[PDB]
Amino acid sequence: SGAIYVGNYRVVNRHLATHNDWANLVWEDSSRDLLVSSTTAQGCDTIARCDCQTGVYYCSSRRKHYPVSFSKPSLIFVEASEYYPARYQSHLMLAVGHSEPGDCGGILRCQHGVVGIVSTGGNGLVGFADVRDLLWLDEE
Ligand SMILES: CCN(CC)C(=O)c1ccc(N)cc1
Ligand SMILES: [Zn+2]
DSSP, rough: OOOEEEEEHHHHGGOOOOOHHHHHHHEEGGGGGGEEEEEEEEEOOOOOOOOOEEEEEETTTTTEEEEEEEEEEEEEEOOOOOOOSSSEEEEEEEESSEEEEEEEEEEEEEEEEEEEEEEEHHHHHHEEEEEEEGGGOOOO
């Protein structure tokens, strides 16, 4: 689990969104595994605006931060999940590293701020849902 808090926005994995997330929906994309809900409290997190391909992610299944190299956001096919059908995910970045079902929402960050959240795992790979193209997160 995990979320991004920027301004009056909460970013979570779409498959982990709560009833309150959906009751306060700003935006969701099934193809990206993202949902954004509105918050009353102001968020502190800064979204990276950059093309970094290196950063650090939090891995809850190891209680560790790992530095990773990752691919640019792409349409990637993702193998079977106990949350989704095996299918295409857009705006996904892959790295070599550890990711298990509870690692979703772990934040990937570079020097510019938050890059994305853990969305996929298995086969020694970790997939991150990119948020850097969501420029609208930085106003209203
Ligand atoms: C997580 C999906 N879900 C119900 C399981 C909802 O978002 C939900 C929220 C408000 C509501 N009146 C009805 C449904
Ligand atoms: Zn960066």
